């Protein structure tokens, strides 16, 4: 193997970092552009969100992967900011190289970059500081939602998606809990729908339907028998199997399994139920007994999936048929199969007018790509809105905020005596990378766009005026309603510095080559 | 081999070997030893400071060297300091002998002159009998004599190692008239300091000891490599662990099986079972209850050491011992050895021929360096047992042989006149080896020894008095040699040297 140190170490780091940064910058913001990429599987995957791009690519060098991990934590915490964090990171490394050839050591760069980002978080704290009750939040929240949904491409008739999301963060969450609720949130997508229909499911959906249409399409409030019992083959982990031969053993078996299935239906119905959810579903044979002792049932529920339905409804468990009682039965308001807007979408809902401790956000779209795109718009949208329900502190994106901060950092950069001063000013140009890269997306030259925004930040010292981010020929960020959470941008700025600071610190590299994954 | 032409093997191959030999005994010989790194096929760091060991480990590709290898190995058995000598005397004589050839001296005319000189050298050696001491009842006398041997083989704690080797070798037989080569066996146990090494007598099993004691005087042993997993040949040797149903009856059943085994040895005579085979979980339980010792996990080395002393014989079958498979030791007991718990037997009146010095070092690296000092020192005790003639310290022997051999050129002439002279220089190769260690001029070292004119006293050892020159008395310092050491070395050295010098091209297609 080879020992890479110093210049060898930092040269490699720019080469790896940039490759990721270039795709992200050309997919940045609501003026952002779709990237149609092919795998070696003959398939085609159409992406735009920064996280899916990181999952897709396995480009050389460790530095690629370190950005991948970083983005994943942030999808849960903030949501969006996935494109933004990585493009800002590569800007730091381009500037560091400019200062590195001048003769500046990377530890100088490292401390001054960390110190500059603290100037910027203080600037961004000024813009809002409001925390308001949940009802009042709902109009600002919907305006934020447009933007976020817009940065996964298209946002026209996507106003349902925003209005269902305010309900979705409220139910699962408290106002000052200060914890995550996206493991309580189930995202669901099914092909054949529309992007113009978005529904809020205050229970849970199983993709399964009734065993017969002849069985009733309504079931009472509560009385759900949660079961692990077979009415079809359960596929046993036992071993050597044997089959029936001839007419006589065939007949004996058939009458046996029919006899046992009728006894089972009766004991469920006696302890009080009108919905059987059974792990191992229903056979053609089993249908006959179940209509005859009349009890709606769902055929098949996954092994783990049965747990997820229990916690969500708050219902009280019954593990198995061996464990039947009338003191423990699950919760419902109604059990009915729902046709959303088409008969191509058939999900069967166990919906709650009782306790709900999870929310299923059911979004539809007519084809595979359309649901993919819609799920990722909506989850990220939900997450940014959860930061804002708690504390409704809002800043206007589009790079306006960054320009103001760039002015603030650049001044504060030079008023310290230490050798960091040069780093700190490069930090100010590095914040500017984001309206510069937005411009590439807009259809505008990178350079003059930033300096138009800048004059307007010399006046106010607040983002609410800027340039185009939807494209409509306005010079406003408050008549465009381009809005991101305050914690969210603050998060892209602090995370990116924290990460790149490890990368400047490490110049001790054992690779044979220059990169290994 | 490969084909050769023009009598290349004599001019060419002889000088290639000379060098290959050089500097692996031209600095690890005399009063400070020096480490050399050897990596073996199972790679690990191995430090050598001994002539015989480094050659066993090397693969000799030169056929010229291979003769010289064999004579070093005789000298390893016989002296353990005449082994360092074979190389340096021999290599030097060929380098000088090559010069003579050019002038026109015939290969055999020179060989005549080396042989009359060697017989002559041997006549001088009773003039290099300076004082005689020999107490083999005294640890005090023995340690000074070994002291120059172990010095060459270590860079470590010279003084402390000298007391441990002396303590073992005297104490085992202080009335013997001959000693053995495998009279001391090493036991190499991990941990502690180098100067935390100690002396025990008899067999030590360095591998795990279990069972539970039951005797300290009845030390009968029966030796097996045969496991106790379920291998017994009196009945069937098959196990049943491939079925879950059976395996359970078998685990419970292993208890009773193990009781049958343990009794089977003992009744016919055992108290400590020597087991190179393996002792199961259930097996380990039945011996603890029953209270018979186990010395578990014994490698082939551990079992062989044991067999050779007692005459107990191992089989891969388990059946009650006959008498030829039964041994006895004077005692056994369980006490820590260097501060690690092991079994220690005693032999010093049963048959002796096995004492144990525990070689300690928190890494195996520190141990090898002291393994060389003791193992060579075994055979140096065997010289002092046979004779009392005491030969001055290293390199002080060498000058006088050179001075009286120069006289031997003048009084004899012939065409042997030249050969005798280079025989003289060739004994000076040994203190030139010390001058090359000291890194000062060869010539100046040689100048002092002739100027004071003392013959059996003065040499330049390895000191910080060897850096800015001085000379010192190596007759009186606790640095002594023995007669036979040098008598053997020279004889086999001249054996080796002359016979490589005869060689001529390998004839093949």
């Amino acid at each position: 193997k080879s020992r890479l140190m110093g210049l060898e170490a930092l040269k490699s780091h720019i080469m790896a970092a940039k490759a990721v940064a270039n795709t992200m910058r050309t997919s940045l913001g609501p003026n952002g552009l779709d990237k149609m990429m092919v795998d070696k599987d003959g398939d085609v995957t159409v992406t735009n969100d920064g996280a899916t791009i990181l999952s897709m690519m396995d480009v050389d060098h460790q530095i690629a992967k370190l950005m991948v991990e970083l983005s994943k934590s942030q999808d849960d915490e903030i949501g969006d900011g996935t494109t933004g964090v990585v493009v800002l990171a590569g800007a730091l490394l381009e500037e560091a190289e400019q200062l590195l050839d001048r003769g500046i050591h990377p530890i100088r760069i490292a401390d001054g970059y960390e110190q500059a980002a603290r100037v910027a978080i203080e600037h961004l704290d000024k813009i809002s500081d409001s925390v308001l009750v949940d009802i009042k939040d709902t109009e600002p929240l919907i305006q934020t939602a447009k933007t976020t949904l817009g940065s996964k491409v298209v946002n026209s008739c996507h106003r349902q998606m925003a209005e269902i999301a305010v309900n979705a963060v409220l139910t699962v969450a408290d106002m000052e809990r200060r914890d995550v609720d996206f493991e309580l949130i189930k995202v669901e997508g099914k092909v054949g729908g529309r992007l113009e229909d978005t529904k809020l499911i205050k229970g849970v959906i199983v993709d399964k339907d009734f065993s017969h249409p002849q069985m009733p399409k309504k079931v009472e409030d509560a009385k759900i028998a949660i079961l692990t019992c077979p009415f079809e083959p359960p596929k046993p982990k036992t071993k050597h199997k044997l089959d029936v031969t001839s007419v006589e053993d065939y007949k004996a078996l058939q009458k046996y399994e029919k006899e046992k299935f009728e006894e089972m239906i009766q004991q469920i119905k006696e302890t009080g139920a009108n919905l059987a959810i059974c792990q191992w579903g229903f056979d053609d044979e089993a249908n006959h007994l179940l209509l005859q002792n009349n009890l709606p049932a769902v055929r098949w529920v996954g092994g783990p999936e049965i747990e997820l339905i229990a916690i969500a409804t708050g219902g009280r468990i019954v593990p198995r048929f061996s464990e039947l009682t009338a003191e423990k039965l699950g919760f419902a308001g109604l059990v009915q199969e729902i046709s959303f807007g088409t008969t191509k979408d058939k999900m069967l809902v166990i919906e709650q007018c009782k306790n709900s401790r999870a929310v299923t956000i059911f979004i539809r779209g007519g084809n595979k790509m359309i649901i993919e795109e819609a799920k990722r718009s909506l989850h990220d949208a939900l997450c940014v809105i959860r930061n804002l329900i708690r504390d409704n502190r809002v800043v206007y994106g589009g790079g306006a905020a960054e320009i103001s901060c760039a002015l603030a950092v650049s001044q504060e950069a030079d008023k310290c005596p230490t050798l960091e001063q040069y780093a700190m000013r490069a930090f100010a140009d590095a914040l500017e990378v984001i309206p510069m890269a937005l411009s590439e997306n807009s259809g505008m030259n990178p350079i003059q766009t930033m300096t138009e925004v800048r004059a307007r930040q010399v006046k106010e010292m607040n983002p609410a005026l800027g340039i185009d981010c939807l494209h409509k020929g306005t010079n406003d960020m408050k008549q465009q309603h381009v809005i991101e959470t305050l914690i969210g941008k603050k998060q892209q700025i602090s995370l990116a510095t924290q990460m790149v600071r490890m990368i400047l610190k490490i110049d001790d590299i054992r690779k044979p080559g220059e990169s290994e994954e | 081999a490969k084909h050769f032409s023009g009598l290349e093997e004599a001019v060419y191959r002889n000088i290639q070997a000379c060098k290959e030999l050089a500097q692996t005994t031209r600095t690890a010989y005399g009063p400070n030893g020096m480490n050399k790194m050897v990596i073996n096929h199972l790679e690990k760091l191995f430090v050598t400071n001994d002539a015989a060991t480094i050659l066993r480990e090397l693969e000799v590709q030169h056929p010229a060297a291979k003769m010289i290898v064999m004579a070093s190995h005789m000298q390893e058995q016989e002296v353990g300091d005449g082994t360092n000598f074979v190389l340096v005397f021999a290599g030097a004589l060929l380098e000088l002998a090559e010069e003579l050839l050019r002038i026109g001296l015939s290969v055999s005319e020179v060989i005549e002159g080396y042989e009359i000189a060697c017989r002559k050298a041997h006549e001088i050696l009773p003039n290099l009998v300076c004082c005689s001491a020999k107490n083999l009842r005294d640890i005090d006398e023995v340690s000074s004599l070994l002291r120059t041997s172990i010095m060459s083989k270590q860079y470590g704690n010279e003084v402390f190692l000298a007391k441990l080797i002396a303590q073992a070798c005297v104490s085992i037989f202080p009335d013997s008239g001959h000693f053995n080569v495998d009279n001391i066996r090493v036991c190499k146990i991990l941990g502690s300091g180098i100067s935390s090494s100690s002396v025990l007598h008899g067999m030590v099993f360095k591998k795990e000891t279990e069972g539970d004691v039951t005797s300290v005087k009845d030390a009968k042993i029966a030796v097996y490599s045969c496991p106790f997993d379920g291998m017994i040949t009196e009945t069937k040797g098959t196990v049943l662990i491939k079925t879950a149903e059976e395996l359970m009856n078998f685990s419970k059943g292993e208890e009773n099986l193990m009781d049958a085994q343990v009794k089977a040895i003992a009744d016919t005579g055992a108290n400590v079972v020597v087991t190179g085979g393996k002792v199961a979980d259930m097996a380990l339980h039945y011996a603890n209850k029953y209270n018979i010792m186990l010395v578990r996990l014994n490698s082939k080395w551990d079992l062989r050491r044991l067999c050779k002393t007692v005459g107990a014989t191992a089989l891969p079958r388990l059946t009650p011992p006959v008498l030829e498979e039964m041994g006895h030791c004077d005692s056994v007991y369980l006490s820590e050895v260097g501060d690690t718990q092991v079994v220690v037997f005693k032999h010093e009146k049963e048959d002796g021929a096995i004492s144990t010095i525990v070689l300690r070092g928190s890494t195996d690296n520190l141990m090898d360096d002291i393994e060389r000092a003791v193992d060579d020192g075994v055979n140096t005790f065997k010289v002092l047992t046979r004779d009392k003639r005491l030969v001055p310290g290293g390199g002080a022997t060498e000058i006088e042989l050179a001075k009286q051999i120069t006289s031997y050129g003048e009084t004899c002439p012939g065409l042997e006149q030249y050969a005798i002279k280079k025989f003289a220089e060739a004994f000076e190769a040994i203190p030139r080896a010390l001058a090359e260690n000291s890194g000062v001029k060869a010539n100046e070292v040689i100048s002092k020894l002739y100027a004071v004119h003392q013959e059996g006293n003065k040499n330049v050892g390895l000191d910080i008095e060897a850096e800015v020159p001085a000379v010192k008395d190596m007759l009186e310092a606790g640095i002594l040699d023995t007669y036979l050491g040098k008598y053997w070395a020279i004889k086999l050295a001249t054996n080796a040297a002359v016979t490589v010098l005869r060689v001529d091209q390998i004839i093949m297609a």
Binding site: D414, K415, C416, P417, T418, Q421, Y422 | -
Partner: protein, 58 residues
């Protein structure tokens, strides 16, 4: 050296400069090092003009 003099100029203004004794950072107010005003005006205005021609040059 040039990072530190910037910070001295930012706070104080008329402070430290490169001093021939020290080799480094000490006031030039304590050891007068003067240049005429035209000698510095010349360095800058001529320099810009040359850089102007080259940029304009095809």
């Amino acid at each position: 050296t040039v990072t530190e003099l910037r910070n001295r100029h930012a706070q104080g203004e008329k402070t430290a400069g490169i001093n021939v004794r020290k080799g480094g950072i000490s006031n030039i107010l304590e050891e007068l090092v003067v240049q005429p005003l035209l000698v510095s005006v010349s360095a800058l205005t001529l320099a810009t003009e040359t850089v102007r021609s080259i940029l304009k040059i095809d």
